[PDB]
Each structure stands twice: as structure tokens, then as C-alpha cells.
């Protein structure tokens, strides 16, 4: 019943030529976009290039969005500007933004609110550190993070959650399909107890953190894992096989 | 004998249609780009649209760059990526990034370094708050801010300085051509003492407080004011009259 969601987070990577080559590889894969969501998130300045090269079956979005609206916010991309350009998705709360640019749960909330206000779909990221996990605080941390923004969700097709074990991002140390499943089930329960059972049953919860061609099948098979936010592996032509695992 | 420099900082503003209309009015103005630099800084996702719409006499850039190069920095735009796109200019250290996103003098130093390494031209911003001016710390603050990055400049046509009087933005107080001239003169001396006299005479120093069609000519005629970074006035067709003040 839940539509699977496979997302490519290119992060800060790519040239005009490399994107031309990569998008061409991606375009060779035929899939039904009414059955499966496949979303590519290029660098902002690469968006138009990427959108024009990707076949229409692929969805697209940007890797961040402003917590502010239009106005005097130099360097920011507002949700209203994104919507005017028909950018469909935004990533909010990625670990790297929380770490390097000190984005808070409150920033995450305000970005979600602006995105939803402007009819954008949001891919909302959270997850606990190694320290927090070794202290048995994962559920506590995740609950706090989800609760920061979850009341804002007005359409449970249009908000997609991503569980990022922080120790799993770009490290190769991917959470076992069972370790992720347990967190995902707990995330869905948090959504159930705060938003409703029908709402929890329709919301996509993705796993992020060292997804590759070799572990994607075992991850997607878990009952509460609805796809992936794929980092490094989405920069490769073999990303098509990761998409295939959700087919 | 410095080449004047007029920059449009659109900040977080614009639609596809508004930019089509605005760029068209801009293209109306016959100016010689070898005599005057006119640079427009659209939102990242508007860059390609803006670049295509504007005639080649207008230079273009982006409103911020990453201190990090390529890699796992979700939401960031690297200097290497801007280079590959032939993005000519970047704005660094704009007060709105200092204020809302806690950008430091060190961040400014690193962003300038990244930009110059990748042959980008930089519009580097600084300025003192109301509280700093009222404690008579203007020259001390400016000195500290400029000395944070100034030794990195290797080509004095390629880095352009902007004095942003934060004490005169959203405060009740007003800046005057004389007040701005005095700060500008002090900035040029700092450049003289750190980088040399010929280099200090070469470098453009722009005024970056509230500039409009009424006050632009009084400001540009000051000996050490070499142009402007223009905010909200650059969102209007009358911006051409601001350009005309530097022709």
C-alpha cells in the first residue's frame, strides 16, 4: 500500500559533464513513477541542468530550504521560490547541516512549516549519535526529534521521514536491516500516537546511512522501511540497481 | 582611475516571471562592461535563468559559497562547482549570513580562500553594528574584520570590498556620504598597510548600506567609494539609474 521512495542525495558533488553521464545511465532504467518514487537531489546550481537531463519519470528536489520566506536573507532559497520553479521536494534536517551549520530541531520545524505552506514535499531527516546509542537513548532522541515537527504534517503522502544513524553516514557501518527496522517501527508508533494510525500507516519512513547495491534488498524487505536516502552510492551508475531493489 | 562596480544583490527574492521582466529592463541600458562592472546576484536556483536572460555585458554571481570543497556537505555549493559553471562572482560575509547563520570571520577567510583557489571573484562584506559604533569601535571592528581575510588577496581586481554599516540598517539612524567616505578611506589604509600602496589604490571598495536612486550619486562621488552593493533597490527597473550614477 505504501509507495516506495528511492532518493539520491548527491550532496556537494558533480560537474556538468559528470551529471550528463550519470543522468544518462539513470534514464536507461524504465520504471513506473505511479508505482515507485525516485527522487534526485542535485546541488542547487545544478538543479536546472539535472531536471532537463533526467527523464520525466524521475522526481527532483533540492538539498535544503530556508526557514524564512522571501526577503532579505542573502544566500537562502525560500520555499516560495522553490514552488515557483516547480521544485517538488526538499531535504530538511540532514545530519551534515545539523553538524556543520548547527541547524536545530527548531530550524527543522520552521523549514517544514514553510515547505508545507508552499505545497512542497519534504524529506525530513533525524537520528542519534554513536554516543547517544551506547547510552541507550536512541528512542528518547528520535522521539524528541520527530516531536519537534510532526504536528505540522497535513498530508502523510507529502512528508517523508529519514532515519539516519549518524554513525552510519559515509562510514560503511550501515545499521543491520533488523537494527533499522526496530527504529522504523518505533518511529511509526510515534507518528501513530501523535497523528493517527491511518496517518502512520501511509507515511514513508526511509533508511539513510551507507546504503549500497549489496545491502539495499535486505533493508527494503523490512516491513517498516519504505526506501532509502542514498548518499555516496547515488553518485554511481549502479544506483539503478538500488532503485531496482524497490521494484 | 579604479573601475567602478555596481552589484545587484537580489537576496531571497524573485519569480521566473519577475526576473524575465526585470532582466529585460536591465538589458535596455547601454553601458560598456570594460568601463564599468555590473554584477547581478540571483538566488542559486535562479542563476541559470538569470544568466540566460541577461546580456553578456552583465556579470553574474551567487550570494554565498561553501568553505568546504566537494564532498559530503549537504546543501552547500562548492567553489569548484561554481568554477565548472563559470559563475564569475561570489558574495562572502554578508551580514545576513553573519547574523542569521552565525558566519564568522574565520568562515569568511576560508570562503575567500576557496573562491580564489578556484578563480572566482569575491565580493567580501563587513561592517559594524549600532552598539559597536556607539562605543566608538567602528575602526577597530572594521580593522579586525578586514584583517581576517585581506592577506589572501592575490589579485586586486578580483576581490571587491563592501562596507555594510549595520548601525544604519533597521535602527533609526542614517548614514551619510561623509560617514561612509571616512570608513572607506580607513579600509583603504588597512589594505595599504597590509598589502601595499599600489594594491590599495587598485582595489574596489563599495558602499553597502541602503542605496537608492536618490542617494547613489552623492555616495559614488566620494573619493574612496567605488560603487555599491544594492539590495532592495536592485529589484526595480529604476536600478538602471543607480547604474547610470557610476557610468
State the SS3 of B106-138. Answer: HHHHHHHHHHHHCCCEEEEEECCCHHHHHCCCH
- Tell the CATH topology of B1-247: TIM Barrel (3.20.20)
Contact at 8 Å (CB) between B181 and B222?
yes
Please answer yes or no on whether A74 and B82 come within 8 Å at the CB atom.
no
Contact at 8 Å (CB) between A219 and A180?
yes
Please answer yes or no on whether B74 and A63 come within 8 Å at the CB atom.
yes
Method of determination used here: X-ray
Which of B58, B29, B41, B6 lies closest to B216 in space, CA to CA? B6
User: Measured between CB atoms, does B1 come within 8 Å of chain A?
Assistant: no
B130-165 b/e with 16+ CB inside 10 Å = b?
A: bebbeeeebeebbbebbebbbebbeebebbbbbbbb
A154 C-beta neighbours (distance < 10 Å), count? 9
Closest-approach residue (CA) in chain A for B79: A12
> A69, exposed or middle or buried, with CB in 10 Å at 0-12, 13-18, 19+?
middle
Could you tell me which residues are beta bridge partners of residue A230?
A8
User: Measured between CB atoms, does A96 come within 8 Å of chain B?
Assistant: yes
Residues whose CB is less than 8 angstroms from the CB of residue B203 and which lie 6 or more positions away in sequence, other chains included: B2, B153, B156, B159, B160, B161, B188, B191
- Helix (H) or strand (E) segment spanning residue B194: helix B177-195
Distance from C-alpha of B89 to C-alpha of B41, rounded to nearest angstrom: 8
User: Catalytic one among A80, A88, A164, A186?
Assistant: A164
Residue A156, classed as helix, strand or coil, is: coil
- Within 8 A of B127 by CB-CB distance, chain A residues are none
User: Measured between CB atoms, does B236 come within 8 Å of chain A?
Assistant: no
Cell readout for A1 is 500500500
* A45, A91, A170: best to mutate for the B interface, most B CBs within 10 A: A45
The count of C-alpha atoms lying within 13 angstroms of the C-alpha of B6, restricted to the half-sphere facing its C-beta, is 27
Please answer yes or no on whether A96 and B74 come within 8 Å at the CB atom.
yes
Nominal resolution (angstroms): 2.0
Which of A21, A4, A9 lies closest to A160 in space, CA to CA? A4
User: Measured between CB atoms, does B101 come within 8 Å of chain A?
Assistant: yes
Please answer yes or no on whether B100 and A62 come within 8 Å at the CB atom.
no
The count of C-alpha atoms lying within 13 angstroms of the C-alpha of A142, restricted to the half-sphere facing its C-beta, is 24
Please answer yes or no on whether A75 and B47 come within 8 Å at the CB atom.
no
Work out whether strand B121-126 and strand A89-92 pair parallel, antiparallel, or are unpaired: unpaired
Amino acid at each position: 500500500a505504501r509507495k516506495y521512495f528511492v532518493a539520491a542525495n548527491w550532496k556537494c558533488n558533480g560537474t556538468l559533464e559528470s551529471i550528463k553521464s550519470l543522468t544518462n545511465s539513470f534514464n536507461n532504467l524504465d520504471f513506473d513513477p505511479s508505482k515507485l518514487d525516485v527522487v534526485v537531489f542535485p546541488v542547487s546550481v545544478h538543479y536546472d541542468h539535472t531536471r532537463k537531463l533526467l527523464q520525466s519519470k524521475f522526481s527532483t528536489g533540492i538539498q535544503n530550504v530556508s526557514k524564512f520566506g522571501n526577503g532579505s536573507y542573502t544566500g537562502e532559497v525560500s520555499a516560495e521560490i522553490a514552488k515557483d520553479l516547480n521544485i517538488e521536494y526538499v531535504i530538511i534536517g540532514h545530519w551534515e547541516r545539523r553538524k556543520y551549520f548547527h541547524e536545530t530541531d527548531e530550524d527543522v520545524r520552521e523549514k517544514l512549516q514553510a515547505s508545507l505552506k508552499n505545497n512542497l514535499k519534504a524529506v525530513v531527516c533525524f537520528g542519534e549519535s554513536l554516543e547517544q546509542r551506547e547510552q541507550n537513548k536512541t528512542i528518547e532522541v528520535i522521539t524528541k526529534q520527530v516531536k519537534a515537527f510532526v504536528d505540522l504534517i497535513d498530508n502523510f503522502d507529502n512528508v517523508i521521514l529519514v532515519y539516519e544513524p549518524l554513525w552510519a553516514i559515509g562510514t560503511g557501518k550501515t545499521a543491520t536491516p533488523e537494527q533499522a527496522q526496530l527504529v522504523h517501527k518505533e518511529i511509526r508508533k510515534i507518528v501513530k500516537d501523535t497523528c493517527g494510525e491511518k496517518q502512520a500507516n501511509q507515511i514513508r519512513i526511509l533508511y539513510g546511512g551507507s546504503v549500497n547495491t549489496e545491502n539495499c534488498s535486505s533493508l527494503i524487505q523490512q516491513e517498516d522501511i519504505d526506501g532509502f536516502l542514498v548518499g555516496n552510492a547515488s553518485l554511481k551508475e549502479s544506483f539503478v540497481d538500488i532503485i531496482k531493489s524497490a521494484m
